[PDB]
C-alpha cells in the first residue's frame, strides 16, 4: 500500500511546482489526515506539511498542499535554488497504520 | 484492510416471504 | 531534545539485530515513539508506532512479526529490535518522536535522528 508519485517534477527558481501522490478511497479518501514531509540526502525528512493543508512552526509559507478525493499534492511556490529536496507524502490507512508515500524529488 | 463493500443486504422494504429473493435495488442496498 | 541513534552494524542474515536511539531531556517517556525504515535508493518505509507509555503497541505489515518496539524510560532511549534479517532488508533505521506529548498521532515527525544504516 505505497502511495505512488512522480519521480522527479521539474521547476526553476521563482516558479511554482506542485508534488502530488496518488492513493486510494480506503486510505487518502478515508481521514483527512494527509502530510507531507521534505527530505534531503544524508539526512532525516523533516516535517513541513500535515493535516492536509496545515504546517508546523518554522515551515516556510511558501510549501501549502491541498486534498481532493483520494488524491493528494503538495504547493510549492517561489522556489529558491535551496529548495532542492525529495518530498514524501504520509497519510493514516487505518486501523491506526501509517504508510509513506514513494517520494518526489524537487529540481530547481 | 481496505473493507470488503461486494457483500451488500436489503435494508428497507414490506416484509420478505419464506425462502423468497429479493432482487430490487433512500437506497435500500447498503454495503 | 537531540535523538541519537545507535546499534547499526553489518550482520549476516538470519541473526537477530536490535536498534536503539537516545532521546536528550526527560520528556521521552512523555512523547511516543516512531520507527522509520529508508532503504538506499528507495522511499520512506514505516516500522510501528509505540506510545509513550509503550502500551499499546503499532506495527507495519511489512515488518509485522519481525521488528519489536519497545521504549526503556530510565534511560531515555527507545529500542527497535529485528529478528532474522534478510538481505532485501538493509536500510537506515531512524526513530522518531511524536509532535505532540503523550499519543496523538494525528501530526508529522517533529524530531527525528541522525539515522542508523543497516547491512544484511
Known sequence: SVLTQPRSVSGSPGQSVTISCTGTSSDVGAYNYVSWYQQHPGKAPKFMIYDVDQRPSGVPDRFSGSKSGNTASLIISGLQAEDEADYYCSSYAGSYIWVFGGGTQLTV | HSGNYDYWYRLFRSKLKPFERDISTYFPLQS | ?120
Open chain 3, 1 to 120: 531534545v537531540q535523538l541519537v541513534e545507535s546499534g547499526g552494524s553489518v550482520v549476516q542474515p538470519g541473526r537477530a539485530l536490535r536498534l536503539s536511539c537516545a532521546a536528550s531531556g526527560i520528556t521521552f517517556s512523555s512523547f511516543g515513539m516512531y520507527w522509520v525504515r529508508q532503504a538506499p535508493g528507495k522511499g520512506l518505509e514505516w516500522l510501528g508506532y509505540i506510545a509513550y507509555d509503550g502500551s499499546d503497541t503499532y506495527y507495519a505489515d511489512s515488518v509485522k512479526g519481525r521488528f519489536t518496539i519497545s521504549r526503556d524510560n530510565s534511560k531515555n532511549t527507545l529500542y527497535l529490535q529485528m529478528n532474522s534479517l534478510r538481505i532485501e532488508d538493509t536500510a537506515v533505521y531512524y526513530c522518531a518522536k511524536d509532535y505532540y506529548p503523550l499519543l496523538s498521532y494525528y501530526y508529522g515527525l517533529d524530531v527525528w535522528g541522525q539515522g542508523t544504516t543497516v547491512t544484511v
